[PDB]
Design brief:
The chain is an alpha+beta fold. The protein is 41% helix and 18% strand. Keywords: Antiviral defense, Plasmid.
């Protein structure tokens, strides 16, 4: 019995400009003292929020109504008795090491032939000892973000994706940790849900051969999913190795995680919004709207509603939106990313949404034209069909700064536009930004094209076509 997550320092928070570590108790009871959960890993940031939310939802058996969240923001804190009563009732499920119920672990996982604790981390002797605080964070992350793939332990060939292994996570944020939790405390009922610690401790017998299958539903059940079997092995003052086996098999269900958005395919399947490379995330902001017809993250929906109510009572209504997740290449993870945007005053109003649809359409049409222009340049430079011809064309086209520079410039301009999406004058700001991004990108392509006599016919033609595109704004 060692290291209780309610009491020990393990959640890194910003307090008065310095980073300190706190336990679940203090993070909740004193949320307003911390500017934010502060960690270099976006996955850590996400899970630490999801765990705290899980506790709040159960301790508070709510909030049932958006009005309750406002009352708590107004008072400047959560009701405290319910929270300390709840933390007291479940204290003994919150030890990192425990004879019978270690937090998010399997007590009877075999101690011998363990794996390095590094397996928990995204990948993405020379094995360092982790602290309990680090082991705790790495566990929470792996349990939420682990991709499917080969396992081959205890009668399980391959494991399934952990719950949020794939989608971008929408996390609205305010001026302090209290406000940030409030902004994510989507109205909730306890019925038929339960986080991992409210259920009997899992045993290897239940997990071997994937014997235990759960429908992937229930908010706090999902926030605290036992995706893998883990048993961290205490080495005295830290952790190097763990027992490792299958977790609970997720059965498919209707439930959508509150932090997850959706959009439609090109006819006509719903998919989760994802982080990717080669695509700016905001380019999907219109497709996630109901009239498109995707589904907005419940957290985003709830924050935007709350913001409207804070503005109505003269309270500070300025909020930020953070998007957290993994870029994943099938079953590899390519990157961990944190994106940051304004949460515009009246985002989910017909006018703002309509400004958004137009803005993204303009950018997308101009970008499509720039893309074709780059393909024509590439054809012009290379020549006619005879290294693989088409690969040499794709190589060359990808080699031009045209599209890449265009989108990179719009990443810069989007937030200042987005923040004013409610207004009508913002379309004109955006139009100019489109023009400017296009110009800078083309200039950089002119430079690239003036280094040998080869590139010139393509330059002449391209200049002509670029003139065209621009004349249509």
């Amino acid at each position: 019995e060692k290291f209780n997550l309610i009491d020990e320092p393990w959640i890194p928070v910003l307090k008065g400009g310095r980073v300190v570590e706190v336990g679940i108790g203090e993070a909740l009871l004193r949320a307003h003292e911390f500017a934010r959960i502060e960690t270099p890993s976006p996955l850590e940031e996400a899970v630490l929020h999801r765990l705290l939310l899980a506790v709040l939802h159960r301790a508070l058996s709510g909030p049932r109504c958006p009005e309750d969240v406002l009352d708590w923001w107004r008072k400047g804190g959560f009701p405290q008795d319910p929270i300390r009563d709840y933390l007291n009732r479940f204290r003994d499920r919150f030890f990192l090491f425990h004879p019978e119920a270690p937090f998010l672990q399997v007590a009877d996982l075999p101690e011998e032939n363990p794996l390095p604790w590094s397996k928990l981390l995204p990948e993405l002797e020379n094995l360092p000892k982790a602290t309990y605080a680090q082991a705790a964070r790495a566990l929470l992350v792996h349990q939420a973000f682990a991709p499917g793939g080969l396992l081959r332990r205890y009668g399980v060939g391959s494991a399934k994706d952990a719950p949020v292994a794939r989608p971008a996570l929408f996390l609205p944020t305010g001026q302090n940790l209290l406000e940030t939790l409030l902004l994510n405390l989507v109205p909730y009922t306890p019925e038929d849900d339960a986080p991992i610690w409210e259920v009997p401790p899992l045993r290897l017998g239940d997990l071997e051969g994937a014997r235990t299958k759960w429908p992937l539903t229930g908010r706090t059940r999902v926030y605290t999913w036992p995706a893998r079997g883990v048993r961290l092995l205490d080495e005295g003052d830290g952790v190097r190795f763990m027992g490792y086996g299958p977790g609970v098999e997720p059965l498919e269900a209707t439930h959508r995680d509150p932090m997850v958005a959706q959009r439609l395919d090109a006819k006509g399947n719903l998919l989760v919004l994802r982080l990717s490379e080669e695509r700016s995330f905001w380019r999907d902001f219109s497709a996630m709207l109901p009239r498109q017809g995707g589904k907005v993250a419940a957290t985003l929906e709830h924050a935007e509603n709350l913001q409207g109510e804070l503005e109505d009572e003269g309270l500070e209504g300025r909020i930020t939106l953070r998007v957290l997740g993994q870029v994943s290449d099938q079953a590899k993870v390519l990157d961990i990313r944190r994106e940051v945007y304004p949460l515009p005053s009246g985002l989910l109003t017909p006018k703002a949404e309509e400004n958004l649809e137009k803005a993204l359409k303009m950018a997308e049409e101009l970008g499509q034209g720039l893309k074709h222009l780059a393909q024509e340049v590439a054809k012009a430079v290379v020549g006619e069909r005879d290294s693989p011809y088409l690969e040499e064309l794709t190589k060359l086209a990808n080699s031009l700064p045209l599209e890449r520079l265009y989108w990179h410039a719009l990443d810069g301009a989007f937030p200042r536009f987005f923040a004013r999406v409610e207004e009508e004058a913002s379309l004109d700001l955006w139009r100019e930004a489109l023009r400017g991004a296009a110009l800078e990108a083309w200039k950089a392509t002119r430079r690239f094209l003036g280094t040998g006599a080869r590139h010139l016919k393509a330059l002449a033609q391209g200049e002509q076509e670029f003139g065209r595109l621009l004349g249509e704004l």
